[PDB]
Amino acid sequence: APTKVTFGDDTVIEVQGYKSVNITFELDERIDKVLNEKCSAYTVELGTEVNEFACVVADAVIKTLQPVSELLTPLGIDLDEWSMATYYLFDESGEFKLASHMYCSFYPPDE
C-alpha cells in the first residue's frame, strides 16, 4: 500500500518504495545466458519477502521459455517439470534476504 504524505495546505502525495533487483540465473548453465537477458530485470517493493518474490521470478522464467518450448526438449529441459521446481533466491554472500544482486538456482545456497 502506498504511503500517503500530507503537507498541510491542500496537496497530498503518495509514495511507494521499490528496489531494483538484478538476478544472475544459474538454473541450467546452458540457457542461463538467455535468462540473464530476457527475465533478469526486476523491481520489487521494500516490504516484500524472498519467499514470495521467488514466485514472480518463477512465473517469469517459464513465461520467457514457454514460446520456445520445442527448442528446449533437445536440450533435455522440461518446462512442465520446471514449472513445479523450487526456485531459490539468496544474497550475493548466500542468504535468503533481499538484495541488489541475487542468484536463482534449484539448490540451496551451499552451507
The CA distance from 49 to 32, in Å, is 24
Q: Which is nearer to a second copy, 41 or 68 (CB)?
A: 41
Site for a second copy in 29-88 (CB under 8 A): 43, 46
Q: In angstroms, what is the minimal distance from the CB of 52 to a second copy? A: 19
Q: In angstroms, what is the minimal distance from the CB of 26 to a second copy? A: 20
The one segment of 6-14, 24-32, 49-57, 86-94 that binds a second copy by CB under 8 A: 6-14
Q: How far is CA 95 from CA 43, 79, 91, 110, in A?
A: 19, 27, 5, 10
The CA distance from 58 to 54, in Å, is 6
